[PDB]
Amino acid sequence: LERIKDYLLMEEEFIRNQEQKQEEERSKVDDLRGTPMSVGTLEEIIDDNHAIVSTSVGSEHYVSILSFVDKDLLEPGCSVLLNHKVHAVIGVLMDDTDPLVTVMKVEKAPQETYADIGGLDNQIQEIKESVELPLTHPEYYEEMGIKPPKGVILYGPPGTGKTLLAKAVANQTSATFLRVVGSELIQKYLGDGPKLVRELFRVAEEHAPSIVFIDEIDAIGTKRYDSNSGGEREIQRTMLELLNQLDGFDSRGDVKVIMATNRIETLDPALIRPGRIDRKIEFPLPDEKTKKRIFQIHTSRMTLADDVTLDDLIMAKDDLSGADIKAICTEAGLMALRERRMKVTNEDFKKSKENVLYKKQEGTPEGLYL
Amino acid sequence: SYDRAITVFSPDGHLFQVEYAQEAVKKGSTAVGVRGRDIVVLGVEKKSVAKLQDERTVRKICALDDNVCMAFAGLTADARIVINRARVECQSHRLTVEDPVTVEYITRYIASLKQRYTQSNGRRPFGISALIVGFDFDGTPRLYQTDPSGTYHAWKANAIGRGAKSVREFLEKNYTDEAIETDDLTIKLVIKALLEVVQSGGKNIELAVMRRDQSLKILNPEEIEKYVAEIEKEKEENE
Amino acid sequence: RDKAPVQPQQSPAAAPGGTDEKPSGKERRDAGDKDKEQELSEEDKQLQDELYRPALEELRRQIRSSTTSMTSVPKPLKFLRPHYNKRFAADIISVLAMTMSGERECLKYRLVGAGEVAKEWQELDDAEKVQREPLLTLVKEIVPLLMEIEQVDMLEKDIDENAYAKVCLYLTSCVNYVPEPENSALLRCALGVFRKFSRFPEALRLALMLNDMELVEDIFTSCKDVVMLGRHGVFLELSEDVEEYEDLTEIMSNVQLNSNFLALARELDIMEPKVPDDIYKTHLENNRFGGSGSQVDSARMNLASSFVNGFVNQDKLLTDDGNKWLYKNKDHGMLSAAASLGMILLWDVDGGLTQIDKYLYSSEDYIKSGALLACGIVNSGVRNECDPALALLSDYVLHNSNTMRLGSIFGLGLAYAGSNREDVLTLLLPVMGDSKSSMEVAGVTALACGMIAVGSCNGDVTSTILQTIMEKSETELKDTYARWLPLGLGLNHLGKGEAIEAILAALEVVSEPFRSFANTLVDVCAYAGSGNVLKVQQLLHICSEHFDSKEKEEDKDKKEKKDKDKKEAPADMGAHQGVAVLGIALIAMGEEIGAEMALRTFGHLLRYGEPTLRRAVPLALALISVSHDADPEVSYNSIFAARLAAMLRQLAQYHAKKGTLTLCPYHSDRQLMSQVAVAGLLTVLVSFL
Amino acid sequence: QVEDDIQQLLKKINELTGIKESDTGLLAADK
Amino acid sequence: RYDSRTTIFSPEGRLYQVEYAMEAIGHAGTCLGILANDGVLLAAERRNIHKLLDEVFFSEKIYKLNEDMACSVAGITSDANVLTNELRLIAQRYLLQYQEPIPCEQLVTALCDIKQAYTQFGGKRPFGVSLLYIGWDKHYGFQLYQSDPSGNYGGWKATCIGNNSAAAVSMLKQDYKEGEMTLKSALALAIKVLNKTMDVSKLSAEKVEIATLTRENGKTVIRVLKQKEVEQLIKKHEEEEAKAEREK
């Protein structure tokens, strides 16, 4: 019966997403403008009510200003609204940027808090103290004169929940948030490194205290030495642009960065210095104590005959990810669903444990220390 | 430097291959050893029976003299060579010096051989680490350990092989000065160490002791079974 | 196997083939059949056939229950009278009897209004006492008192699953979704099983929702039977309303059994451990007295600062800080500063008289009247400060003792909450009959008699507030009267469970929108909050009313109503444009612990330009948090650097550093856009320890 | 099914809240 | 990366030539021995079964090393000649020293030390040869041993050669025998194993090799048996396949 409630909630949220002047003075604004408005570029403003502009085709004109709002808000470097009759300077353009700003801006917290992963709470406690504490409880930093950390690197074996940690911190926040898969810079475009970078961090500064979240750029740490005999492409120049944007000049502000990698030694050690990126966090193949918690989460709301013990599977083999546990908990459920059965016995878990674990295959010892 | 070869220092002052030949020891089977006051005790884990062979030839605990006992980790061939040379050396010490061999002498020999083996041109380091337990002078129990560098280093208890930090942490969190031995306490201490093993399967336990006057006694995994049962009984008495 | 041997058995109509086939089908009824029961289209013809025909009813309810039906499915079970821990028992009992008996209880619960569904309901209750997983069986068996004998039938062994799980989810969902009249059955049968059980604050929260007088006698013979002790005196006095400590102190004035419940459970022993231990474990420094007490001067901000310094409580230092600070002060701020020595010291009964006594009967009217106001502030159990003020009160139009009437009728409203104190209200008859042009005479009349009258027995329409209705509609002058008299009207309406007093005052009162604003005040106060969404869509429609002050209080009711299900409490009131509505949501956040979404709403509400709304933001902004805390404060310094705004900032600084006692004084604050004479009473929202 | 109750009537009062605004929807230096 | 020579260690630390000597074992002729009391046997696969050879050698994998010991072999062939000469010389020097036959385990450890002498030093190629051992003593009876290029030796009762013989060891475990010492049962088991593992269709007897070792009165004779009994053993096993298809 709850599905009706969830569907009505989603459709009413869409209804709210659809729920998004002057009788004659606004019509005079409609004649203060020519209706095909345009986008230009101020070069100078000789302030005697006519300005010089620049166009996307490059024709630059003494064009008169028609102020309704304060006309001294717009600057050289800020665009204008020019007509097609005399390209008349119309007025208020709130400062717009690329289309690629709303693209990297997640508008939801679609998943849940630290109650989602199972057990790492020493370093989950670290990212806690380095994001959740400086944001929500910023007492002692002012009260002991000590500045909070800025950069956090996630690494280790993959499928530990780096994505899960990412979305978990994407839950518990009131600061604005941005989602950047930072490897997107494969163009054949010279320049165009700094365009995304400068506009991203300008937007980040203009909105709020925020997190600027780069995700999986472990390939792009291109060895910091050359490309071999002839290489130079743009990629070094773009990462150096991001480096200078981070820890050059022009004080950082209330901007946070969390980063995640699978392999870590192939990175660029001109970034991994503290100050530029502060924290580094290991996510290893955990233990046989929080595997119980990962099975506990993955057997929270599934039909399990409690006769079986997952601790038998934990006692079987000891090195696998929590994603492997999720794969087992779904796959044994499918093996139960072979023949319309209620709950899951032991042997579905056995066949599913064997089934998922077809990963490591090498070879031939060791094995033969011995 | 580079990880090639054994002769070059690092730019920050290390030898890569000494630290790196310890890793093969660090990735081997576990074997512990303690001293009681009158009975010395040690043992290996991971019998690892593959259902179809004999295991009386794969024994990791042997002796050089009637007084001294062995153990190792790492790879087994270097253990075979070092044990072979150690028997010869112990007998040659018996040839001139008419003593029962002091443990400190055979450990200095093993470490000296190991270091002059490591210094030379391209001789691959022995990837073992032995435990040399004995009681000679007035029956005073001693146990020394080795290293791929060649550093004999006297202890009172020891843990090597895989995950040795946890096992030595158990000897840290147990290790009571009282009392005394008390061979019963040493036996129960072996039982607690083997229960504190990385796996503690209950059947992969192999332990051998020496009461500082006798020879080596290989046990039977039913006495050890009742030992595990009474350890579980004391664990129930904790509740 | 294949259905070839077993499938044509439905074709004969001979009795022995049925009477052995149905036990043969009972053995295969552990999985129902091989499959999803495609015997249906062939065996539905067998309906008209009539020995072991109740076994045929078992087959018929088995297959009709197996596919789908809403009323014809439990008909073979109510015809069957079920007869003749297992997997089959989990099948025909658990899912089939739970869902099938559930739709029978729903369909006959909405249809007719028999004993058959009562017997089946007790049988399924017993079977789910066998299954022992409550939670879903419980919430199913709510909607059929039935739930009473369900609880006393169920409660033998498991205490915390039924208590914690059942009473948590069904208390929360019962105030959340369920209407009121079954919550009384929750409270009374929970009084039964919790009367069986220990850990008595479950029964004390039953005293919170019940407001019963037998309960406190039972929990004091039982909580004296369980000898912490003064600590349950503390949250006893915090938890209790105005009525039951005076009924408690009169029946315990009779019995008392050790007299230590007359010590604890009236007054003075919630407060004797705290203030020394407040001095002991806390150590508050001096640079906010000096720094936050340095924030410049101007007899307003400075005057406010005296209030800020005064509400500091490390000793009653700001009390005894010399002279010439109150001599700089002026009339209604002299009320605020004469009461401020009340505010520093809401304890020290013997010290209250010997500190206020210098400012008692002084040269100034405001010093003496705010001094008796301070005497009303400091305590609530003394009642010997009445007579020096009480004797003077009468002035017959507008002399001195009417301002002592304001501080002393108000401070005596702070002082006592009897079964119905009547002597002070017989004093209140020449008060409203006096009717000074000073607003706060009738203001603290309505508010003070309301503080006497909050928690009345489903309210009352008695001649007290009936008299202030008729004498209210006597004089249509100074509309603050027409606002703060329906305050105390709705305060006497508080204590309701089912009151028709909105209809009674609807017949007596309603007119031109002064008294239709009285109608919306009674409409606010009579409707504390339940699962009663019909007045929330009434809120939706009459929220669009062109008179924009019944909008103010009528939309302002929301933080009273949905205070528990507070996730829906974020609304689009900021997305509206009737700026007092942004004021309403600005109230509706308030003071609790105040999550990041609330401060995120203070991101926009912090930035506004009208001085009553920019004034309105730091008050609830720093109530909701009682750098981080001081970061929006210095942000307000960035906002201004008017005088109102400076005052608002001071109020925010003061803030920085359903119990009715915290429900009244901010709705008393809701007419703030006014004189400092009104702000002379601004320091009477005494809602914090 | 108490959670069904909880989420259902929550979203239902939220639907009412949407219906609220849905029903409540009804030069000298420049020109 | 850390390839270059047999020495020195890799950074974990593992070995290079050790793993690669094992992978040099895996592509060789398949051998096995069986659990038997009162006798012990060997099985071997003929590499290069081409029609233009001579077969006048009577033994291409077996080497009757002392008198009461033979050995199969697998790996690079001419290193094994280097090993067999030295092994015969070691056992014969032992017999010269004591006038008692060599009790086979110190023989095995002598050869393991010979192999290990090229595992440690640099720079020499390690011996990429694993090989079997059958034999008899005064101290344990019939024995079976498995040499390895590391210098490790494992006393098995049912052995293992490379990539062709993992399924053979799986069959030896799933068809484990104990108590039955009859040579003919073990021969039928070996016929079954080599029928499955070798891809020779219907198991031509020219592509196989069988040698046995029995204790006869005080002699410990080694029977490198002829071909007719191999033919009738194949006929025996195919009649037992007819018994296996009595289930259809």
Is residue C132 within 8 angstroms of chain A, CB to CB? Answer: no
Which DSSP string corresponds to C336-379?
HHHTHHHHS-S--HHHHHHHHTTTTT-S-HHHHHHHHHHHHHH-
Name the token pair of C263: 């010590």
Give the torsion through C-alpha atoms of A206, A211, A215, A221, to 10 deg. 80
Q: Are C525 and C494 in contact (CB under 8 A)?
A: yes
Task: Say which residue the tokens 């009505």 belong to.
Answer: A8
Name the token pair of C254: 């009779």
State the nearest Cα–Cα gap between A186 and chain D, in angstroms: 44
In whole angstroms, give the CA distance from residue B83 to residue B69: 11
Contact A5 D8 (CB under 8 A): yes
Q: Are C304 and C325 in contact (CB under 8 A)?
A: no
Q: Are C665 and C684 in contact (CB under 8 A)?
A: yes
Cβ density class E144-155: b for 16+ within 10 Å, e for less: bbbbbbbbbbbb
Give the torsion through C-alpha atoms of E107, E108, E109, E112, to 10 deg. 130
User: Radius of gyration (Cα) for chain D, nearest Å?
Assistant: 20
Estimate the share of chain D in helix, then strand, then coil, as percent rounded to the nearest 5: 70, 0, 30
In whole angstroms, give the CA distance from residue E46 to residue E30: 9
Name the token pair of E111: 């050869």
In whole angstroms, give the CA distance from residue C279 to residue C274: 9
Q: Which of E14, E23, E26 sits opposite A366 (nearest CB)?
A: E14
Give the chains touching A; criterion: ≥3 Cβ pairs < 8 Å.
Answer: B, C, D, E
**Domains, chain B, ranges and CATH?**
1-239 (3.60.20.10)
In whole angstroms, give the CA distance from residue E98 to residue C492: 119
Assign C524 to helix, strand or coil.
Answer: helix
In whole angstroms, give the CA distance from residue A349 to residue A335: 8
In whole angstroms, give the CA distance from residue D5 to residue D11: 10
Beta bridge partners of A268: none
In whole angstroms, give the CA distance from residue C303 to residue C287: 18
Q: Which ranges in E27-76 belong to alpha helices (H)?
A: none
Minimal CA–CA distance to B125: which of B238, B229, B23? B23
Q: Are C165 and C156 in contact (CB under 8 A)?
A: no
Q: What is the 3-state secondary structure (H, E, C) of chain A?
A: CHHHHHHHHHHHHHHHHHCCCCCCHHHHHHHHCCCCCCCCCCCECCCCCEEECCCCCCCCCEEEECCCCCCCCCCCCCCCCCCCCCCCECCCCCCCCCCCCCCCCCCCCCCCCCCCCCCCCCCHHHHHHHHHHHHHCCHHHHHCCCCCCCEEEEECCCCCCHHHHHHHHHHCCCCEEEEEECCCCCCCCCCCHHHHHHHHHHHHHHHCCEEEEEECCHHHCCCCCCCCCCCCCCHHHHHHHHHHHHHCCCCCCCEEEEEECCCCCCCCCCCCCCCCCCEEEECCCCCCCCHHHHHHHHCCCCCECCCCCHHHHHHHCCCCCHHHHHHHHHHHHHHHCCCCCCCECHHHHHHHHHHHCCCCCCCCCCCCCC
User: Radius of gyration (Cα) for chain A, nearest Å?
Assistant: 28
| Residue C634, CA atoms < 13 Å, CB-side half-sphere | 5
Query: What are the Cα distances from residue B75, in Å, to A3, B60, B72, B79, B128?
Result: 62, 11, 9, 7, 6
Closest-CA residue of chain A to B48? A370
State the nearest Cα–Cα gap between A218 and chain C, in angstroms: 34
Minimal CA–CA distance to C454: which of C496, C501, C415? C496
Task: Say which residue the tokens 């796996």 belong to.
Answer: B199
In whole angstroms, give the CA distance from residue B73 to residue B61: 11
Query: Residue A156, annotated ligand binder?
Result: yes
- The dihedral through the CA atoms of C352, C354, C359, C362 has a sign that is positive
In whole angstroms, give the CA distance from residue C489 to residue C483: 10
Q: How far is CA B222 from the centre of its chain?
A: 23
Phi (first) and psi of residue B120, to 5 degrees: -75, -175
Q: Which of C599, C629, C631 sits opposite A174 (nearest CB)?
A: C599
Task: Say which residue the tokens 């409690």 belong to.
Answer: A306
The B141-145 sheet, strands edge to edge: B68-69, B131-135, B141-145, B153-155
DSSP C265: B
Query: What are the Cα distances from residue E197, in Å, to A190, A255, C556, E210?
Result: 61, 66, 86, 16
Closest-CA residue of chain B to E157? B53
Minimal CA–CA distance to A120: which of A94, A78, A156, A83? A156
In whole angstroms, give the CA distance from residue E160 to residue E169: 6
Residue A8, sorted as left (phi over 0), alpha (psi -120 to 50) or beta, turns out to be alpha
In whole angstroms, give the CA distance from residue B119 to residue B96: 28
Contact E9 B58 (CB under 8 A): no
- Residues of chain D in Cβ contact (below 8 Å) with chain A: 1, 3-4, 7-8, 11-12, 14-15, 18, 21-22, 27, 29-31
Q: How far is CA B217 from the centre of its chain?
A: 16
| Residue C106: other Cβ atoms inside 10 A | 14
Minimal CA–CA distance to C235: which of C259, C210, C260, C200? C200
Minimal CA–CA distance to C301: which of C333, C277, C323? C333
Judged by CB atoms within 8 Å, which residues 60-119 of B form the interface with E? 75-78, 80-81, 84
Task: Say which residue the tokens 């474990």 belong to.
Answer: C281
Q: Are C121 and C105 in contact (CB under 8 A)?
A: yes
| Cis omega (within 30 of 0) for bond into C651 | no
Beta bridge partners of E143: E135
Do chain E and D touch: 3 or more Cβ pairs under 8 angstroms? no
Name the token pair of A182: 């930072």
Phi (first) and psi of residue B141, to 5 degrees: -70, 130
Phi (first) and psi of residue C284, to 5 degrees: -100, 135
Q: For residue B26, which amino acid is it?
A: K
Contact C628 A137 (CB under 8 A): yes
Q: Which residues of D touch A25 (CB under 8 A)?
A: 27, 30-31
Q: Which residues of D touch A4 (CB under 8 A)?
A: 8
Name the token pair of C162: 């039924």
In E111-172 the beta strands, taken as DSSP E runs, fall at 129-130, 132-136, 142-147, 153-154
Pairing of strands A62-64, A50-52: antiparallel
Range of the domain at E122: 1-248
Estimate the share of chain E in helix, then strand, then coil, as percent rounded to the nearest 5: 40, 15, 45
Q: Are C60 and C76 in contact (CB under 8 A)?
A: yes
C590 membership: H or E segment, kind and range? none
CATH number for the domain spanning E105: value is 3.60.20.10
Query: Residue A309, annotated ligand binder?
Result: no
Name the token pair of E68: 């009461």
In whole angstroms, give the CA distance from residue B56 to residue B62: 11
Assign E33 to helix, strand or coil.
Answer: strand
Q: Which residues of B touch A369 (CB under 8 A)?
A: 24, 27-29, 73-76
Task: Please measure the distance between the N-terminal and C-terminal CA atoms of chain E and give it in whole angstroms.
Answer: 57
Contact D12 C140 (CB under 8 A): no
Q: How many domains is chain E built from?
A: 1
Is C251 buried (19+), middle (13-18) or exposed (0-12) by CB count in 10 A? middle
C491 membership: H or E segment, kind and range? helix C481-493
Beta bridge partners of A50: A64
| Residue B183: other Cβ atoms inside 10 A | 15
Is A59 buried (19+), middle (13-18) or exposed (0-12) by CB count in 10 A? exposed
- The dihedral through the CA atoms of E86, E90, E95, E97 has a sign that is positive
Q: Are B32 and B158 in contact (CB under 8 A)?
A: yes
Give the chains touching B; criterion: ≥3 Cβ pairs < 8 Å.
Answer: A, E
Q: Which residues of B touch E8 (CB under 8 A)?
A: 3-6, 17, 122, 124-125
Q: Are B39 and B209 in contact (CB under 8 A)?
A: yes
Beta bridge partners of B44: B31, B206
Q: Are C556 and C588 in contact (CB under 8 A)?
A: yes
Minimal CA–CA distance to E175: which of E185, E189, E194? E189
In whole angstroms, give the CA distance from residue B74 to residue B76: 6
| Residue A40, CA atoms < 13 Å, CB-side half-sphere | 30
Note the resolution in Å, 1 decimal: 4.2
In whole angstroms, give the CA distance from residue A308 to residue A302: 14
In whole angstroms, give the CA distance from residue C244 to residue D18: 42
Minimal CA–CA distance to C136: which of C98, C164, C110, C109? C98
C587 membership: H or E segment, kind and range? helix C580-589
In C109-241 the beta strands, taken as DSSP E runs, fall at none
Name the token pair of C596: 């990041």
| Residue C370: other Cβ atoms inside 10 A | 35
Beta bridge partners of E147: E153
Contact A67 D29 (CB under 8 A): yes
In whole angstroms, give the CA distance from residue B233 to residue B236: 5
In whole angstroms, give the CA distance from residue A174 to residue A185: 29
Q: Name, in order, each residue with C-beta under 8 angstroms of D10's C-beta and a sequence gap of 6 or more.
A: C565, C567, C568
Task: Say which residue the tokens 């092994």 belong to.
Answer: E87
Assign C666 to helix, strand or coil.
Answer: helix
Contact D15 A66 (CB under 8 A): no
Give the torsion through C-alpha atoms of C11, C13, C16, C19, to 10 deg. 80
| Residue E206: other Cβ atoms inside 10 A | 13
Determine the length of chain D: 31
| Cis omega (within 30 of 0) for bond into B181 | yes
DSSP E66: S
Closest-CA residue of chain A to C571? A16
Query: What are the Cα distances from residue C15, in Å, to C12, C41, C44, C49?
Result: 9, 21, 17, 10
Contact E19 A365 (CB under 8 A): yes
Minimal CA–CA distance to C170: which of C154, C216, C238? C154
Minimal CA–CA distance to D20: which of C529, C516, C573, C522? C573
Is residue B5 within 8 angstroms of chain E, CB to CB? Answer: yes
Closest-CA residue of chain C to D8? C177
Which DSSP string corresponds to chain B?
--SS-TTPPPTTS--HHHHHHHHHHHTS--EEEEE-SS-EEEEE------SSB--TTS-S---SSSSEE----S-HHHHHHHHHHHHHHHHHHHHHS-SPPPHHHHHHHHHHHHHHHHHSSSPPP-----EEEEE-GGG-EEEEE--TT---EEESEEEESTTHHHHHHHHHTT--S-S---HHHHHHHHHHHHHTSSS--SSS-EEEEE-SSS--EE--TTHHHHHHHHHHHHHHHT-
Name the token pair of C386: 């009445």
Q: Which of A138, A142, A174 sits opposite C600 (nearest CB)?
A: A174
Is residue E2 within 8 angstroms of chain B, CB to CB? Answer: yes
Q: Which residues of D touch C536 (CB under 8 A)?
A: 13, 16
Name the token pair of A226: 């050359």
In whole angstroms, give the CA distance from residue A58 to residue A78: 16
DSSP C14: -
Minimal CA–CA distance to C293: which of C307, C314, C309? C309
Q: For residue C281, which amino acid is it?
A: K
Query: Residue A365, annotated ligand binder?
Result: no
Is A225 buried (19+), middle (13-18) or exposed (0-12) by CB count in 10 A? exposed
In whole angstroms, give the CA distance from residue C121 to residue C104: 10
Minimal CA–CA distance to E145: which of E180, E112, E187? E112
Give the torsion through C-alpha atoms of C341, C344, C347, C349, to 10 deg. -20
Query: What are the Cα distances from residue B197, in Å, to A318, B175, C611?
Result: 15, 16, 73
Cβ density class A142-178: b for 16+ within 10 Å, e for less: eeeeeebbbbbbbbbebbbbbbbbbbbbbbbbbbebb
